[PDB]
Amino acid sequence: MSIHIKDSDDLKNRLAEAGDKLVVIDFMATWCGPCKMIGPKLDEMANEMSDCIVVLKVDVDECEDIATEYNINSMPTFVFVKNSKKIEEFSGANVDKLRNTIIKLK
Amino acid sequence: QKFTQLLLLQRPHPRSQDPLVKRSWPDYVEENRGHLIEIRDLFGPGLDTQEPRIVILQGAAGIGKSTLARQVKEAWGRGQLYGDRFQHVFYFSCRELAQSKVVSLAELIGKDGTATPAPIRQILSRPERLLFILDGVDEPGWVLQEPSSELCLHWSQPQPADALLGSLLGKTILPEASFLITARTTALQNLIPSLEQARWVEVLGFSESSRKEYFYRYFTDERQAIRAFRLVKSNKELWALCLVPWVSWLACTCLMQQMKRKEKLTLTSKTTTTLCLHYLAQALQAQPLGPQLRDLCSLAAEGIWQKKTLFSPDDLRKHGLDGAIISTFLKMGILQEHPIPLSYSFIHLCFQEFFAAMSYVLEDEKTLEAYGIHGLFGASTTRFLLGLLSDEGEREMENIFHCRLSQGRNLMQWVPSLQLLLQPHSLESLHCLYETRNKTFLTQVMAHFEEMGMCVETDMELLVCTFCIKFSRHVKKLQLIEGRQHRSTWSPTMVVLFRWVPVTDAYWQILFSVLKVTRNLKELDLSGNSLSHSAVKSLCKTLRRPRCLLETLRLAGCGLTAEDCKDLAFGLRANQTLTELDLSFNVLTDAGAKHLCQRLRQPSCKLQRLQLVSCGLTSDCCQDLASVLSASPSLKELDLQQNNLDDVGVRLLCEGLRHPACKLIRLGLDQTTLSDEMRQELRALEQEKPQLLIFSRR
Numbered sequence: 001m002s003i004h005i006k007d008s009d010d011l012k013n014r015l016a017e018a019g020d021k022l023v024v025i026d027f028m029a030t031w032c033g034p035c036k037m038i039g040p041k042l043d044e045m046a047n048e049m050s051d052c053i054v055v056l057k058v059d060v061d062e063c064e065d066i067a068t069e070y071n072i073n074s075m076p077t078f079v080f081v082k083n084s085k086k087i088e089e090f091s092g093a094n095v096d097k098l099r100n101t102i103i104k105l106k
Numbered sequence: 107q108k109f110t111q112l113l114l115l116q117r118p119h120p121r122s123q124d125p126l127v128k129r130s131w132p133d134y135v136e137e138n139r140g141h142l143i144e145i146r147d148l149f150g151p152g153l154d155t156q157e158p159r160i161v162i163l164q165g166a167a168g169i170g171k172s173t174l175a176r177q178v179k180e181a182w183g184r185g186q187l188y189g190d191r192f193q194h195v196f197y198f199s200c201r202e203l204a205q206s207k208v209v210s211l212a213e214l215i216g217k218d219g220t221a222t223p224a225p226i227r228q229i230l231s232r233p234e235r236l237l238f239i240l241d242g243v244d245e246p247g248w249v250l251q252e253p254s255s256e257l258c259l260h261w262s263q264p265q266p267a268d269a270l271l272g273s274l275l276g277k278t279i280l281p282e283a284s285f286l287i288t289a290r291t292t293a294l295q296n297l298i299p300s301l302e303q304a305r306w307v308e309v310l311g312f313s314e315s316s317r318k319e320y321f322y323r324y325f326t327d328e329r330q331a332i333r334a335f336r337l338v339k340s341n342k343e344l345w346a347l348c349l350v351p352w353v354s355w356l357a358c359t360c361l362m363q364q365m366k367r368k369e370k371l372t373l374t375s376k377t378t379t380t381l382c383l384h385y386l387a388q389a390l391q392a393q394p395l396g397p398q399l400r401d402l403c404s405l406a407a408e409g410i411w412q413k414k415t416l417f418s419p420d421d422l423r424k425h426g427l428d429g430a431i432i433s434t435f436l437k438m439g440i441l442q443e444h445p446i447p448l449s450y451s452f453i454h455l456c457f458q459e460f461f462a463a464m465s466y467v468l469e470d471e472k473t474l475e476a477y478g479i480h481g482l483f484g485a486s487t488t489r490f491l492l493g494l495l496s497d498e499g500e501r502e503m504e505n506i507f508h509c510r511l512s513q514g515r516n517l518m519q520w521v522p523s524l525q526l527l528l529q530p531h532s533l534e535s536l537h538c539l540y541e542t543r544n545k546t547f548l549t550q551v552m553a554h555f556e557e558m559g560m561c562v563e564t565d566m567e568l569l570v571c572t573f574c575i576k577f578s579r580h581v582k583k584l585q586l587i588e589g590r591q592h593r594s595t596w597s598p599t600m601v602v603l604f605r606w607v608p609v610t611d612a613y614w615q616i617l618f619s620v621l622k623v624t625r626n627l628k629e630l631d632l633s634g635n636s637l638s639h640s641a642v643k644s645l646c647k648t649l650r651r652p653r654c655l656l657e658t659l660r661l662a663g664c665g666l667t668a669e670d671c672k673d674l675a676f677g678l679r680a681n682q683t684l685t686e687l688d689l690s691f692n693v694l695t696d697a698g699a700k701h702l703c704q705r706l707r708q709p710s711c712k713l714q715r716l717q718l719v720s721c722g723l724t725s726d727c728c729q730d731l732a733s734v735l736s737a738s739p740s741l742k743e744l745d746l747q748q749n750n751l752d753d754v755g756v757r758l759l760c761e762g763l764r765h766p767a768c769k770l771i772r773l774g775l776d777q778t779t780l781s782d783e784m785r786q787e788l789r790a791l792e793q794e795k796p797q798l799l800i801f802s803r804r
């Protein structure tokens with residue numbers, strides 16, 4: 001399942017509580033089309049293998065500070081963080097490549 | 107000032123491209139559906155329940171596709187149009203945005219700023235609540251394509267508008283958004299990414315009521331407007347061409363400039379180019395200097411070549427213009443100065459096109475040579491350039507410029523080029539060729555018009571079609587139909603002019619004025635169309651013209667009245683070429699038939715054939731009809747079927763027919779309801795008259 005981030009405190013709390021599970025942060029907007037057509041796919045993948053992967057949903061409009069902190073402008077963007085440290089990031093709604101990145105980084 | 111009304115079509119057929127010419131004839135009439143609409147329904151449901159996403163506004167140059175959207179926005183601002191579906195509207199111009207190359211969503215929102223600047227977050231969280239206005243996607247040389255899609259950029263991030271508007275139209279940023287796209291020419295598939303479903307609105311001009319209010323609402327004093335309207339109505343071709351708001355505005359400006367100091371109103375202009383030259387002559391009062399205007403035309407052509415209208419000050423120096431020349435041009439009014447830092451531009455794109463048309467003729471002395479203007483037959487550049495080479499076109503330029511210039515051979519050499527480039531005949535080509543009002547020209551360039559029929563929409567289009575079809579050789583038959591009652595054959599001499607738009611009493615008023623100097627197109631068909639008394643008066647005026655050569659005319663099922671029949675009979679007196687008159691399925695009375703009977707019995711009016719099927723005539727008028735048969739030496743065939751003529755009428759007609767002077771050969775009379783002895787009398791009459799034949803249904 002996907003968890004919505006409201007502020008930086010919630011973001012750091014989820015990263016702290018994730019432990020050794022791989023973490024994916026997605027940047028999506030209501031007006032964005034690719035974001036809301038790739039969101040269901042990411043949710044299905046998270047449901048399939050929730051024992052190893054956790055997906056976090058953050059809104060750029062409501063969390064501009066988070067976007068400025070992670071230095072991303074284009075959407076959709078998926079950020080992979082391992083042990084509270086970023087390991088990989090990319091932009092684009094390419095379902096196959098994001099599946100591959102999750103598979104390699106899990 | 108006030109937004110004069112414009113007609114708008116709602117064709118439920120995508121006008122993307124027609125590579126496979128026209129193919130079957132019913133397909134072509136099916137495509138042009140029409141379905142006129144009001145302003146408060148442009149973004150309505152439509153035929154099905156699927157509301158349109160992108161609305162395209164096509165039309166001619168200056169047709170009004172740059173003010174309709176402004177009126178919509180202003181009306182919403184005062185709250186009288188779409189106050190419940192669009193939370194906000196955004197006004198953008200592609201020509202204005204072409205100058206800058208660094209723009210973003212936040213930047214365009216700030217530049218628009220119709221109200222107090224609202225936060226972007228709530229603007230972008232309501233997709234199906236916004237409207238976007240553009241003033242022509244063809245004015246700049248944009249592509250409007252998104253880069254590889256699959257991603258959207260954040261607002262306030264710099265991006266060329268070429269990819270930004272393309273992303274907006276590509277269902278990427280603000281996907282469910284309504285776009286008020288305005289275009290001049292069709293085939294926007296290359297310019298619009300995956301357009302597919304779109305509402306194709308065709309912008310028309312000013313109808314009779316709209317022209318009335320526009321001419322009334324232009325001056326201050328009522329008498330000035332009254333005399334202006336009277337003169338414009340007197341010049342019929344100006345009435346036909348004043349549909350376009352540009353033409354009406356130019357005519358009104360010319361009238362005001364004439365009436366300014368001391369002049370009498372005189373407009374012999376019958377085409378757009380001649381009116382433009384007359385306006386230029388009014389602006390060029392005296393001023394013997396000529397090279398300055400040539401340099402202005404050259405700069406206009408150079409600007410239109412590189413998709414430019416806003417001329418930079420340095421571009422004026424390289425073309426020879428100086429401070430005094432610019433001051434004089436502003437003083438007269440060809441150029442305008444905006445509250446913008448130093449720059450100059452024309453007052454309209456159409457004048458820029460007109461001046462780009464004169465530089466070519468001033469420097470020259472096929473479609474490849476039209477690369478700078480482009481749009482074969484789809485650009486008013488070609489229209490003005492062609493019309494400037496006519497005898498009337500090459501008549502006013504010789505006063506502004508002291509050069510003699512070519513005498514008709516600069517158009518004779520254009521004849522083979524156009525003739526080679528006019529195999530796919532079209533309406534815009536017809537406007538371009540009509541702009542050249544020459545008998546010598548329009549006899550080899552249009553003597554290939556072997557069409558089968560086409561759509562006629564406007565008054566100027568009808569005038570152009572009549573003028574061009576007349577100046578040919580193959581056509582003999584001209585037919586006009588209301589379209590729903592489409593019943594026509596496929597003869598090579600058949601041209602089918604169909605309309606699916608309701609018109610005011612000017613469709614025939616302007617058509618009857620074109621039958622002057624008629625060519626071999628003698629036969630005329632207008633059956634089915636509903637006329638009025640004034641239209642019939644105009645038709646009889648046309649029949650009265652000495653040089654009119656109408657040989658056979660039919661008026662079947664036009665809902666004629668008895669009063670107009672007297673006018674028709676009077677019009678027939680000044681005619682010696684009409685031979686066949688058809689009044690089948692018409693509503694006449696005994697007195698109406700009396701008016702025809704008075705003229706028919708005269709030795710003149712050599713009408714060989716006459717049809718009176720279903721005219722409701724009774725036995726009262728058979729006395730006059732019998733007098734006609736017993737007096738007229740020219741009636742060869744007469745039809746009187748579908749008439750409740752009873753026994754007395756048949757006996758009266760037999761008295762007339764028995765006269766040896768009768769010239770009738772074949773007559774149509776009903777005999778089902780006649781008595782037993784009536785068939786015996788008719789049989790004996792036919793026996794004693796072998797040249798007499800009576801026919802019926804079957």
Ligand SMILES: Nc1ncnc2c1ncn2[C@@H]1O[C@H](COP(=O)(O)OP(=O)(O)OP(O)(O)=S)[C@@H](O)[C@H]1O
Nearest residue numbers: 108109110167168169170171172173351352355455
């Ligand atoms: N409803 C209207 N009422 C009064 N004047 C009008 C109306 N519509 C257009 N005009 C006049 O038409 C001229 C402006 O026409 P535009 O719509 O700007 O031409 P256009 O569509 O831009 O053609 P282009 O430049 O070739 S794309 C001005 O002189 C206006 O006064």
Ligand SMILES: [Mg+2]
Nearest residue numbers: 171172241242
């Ligand atoms: Mg425009």
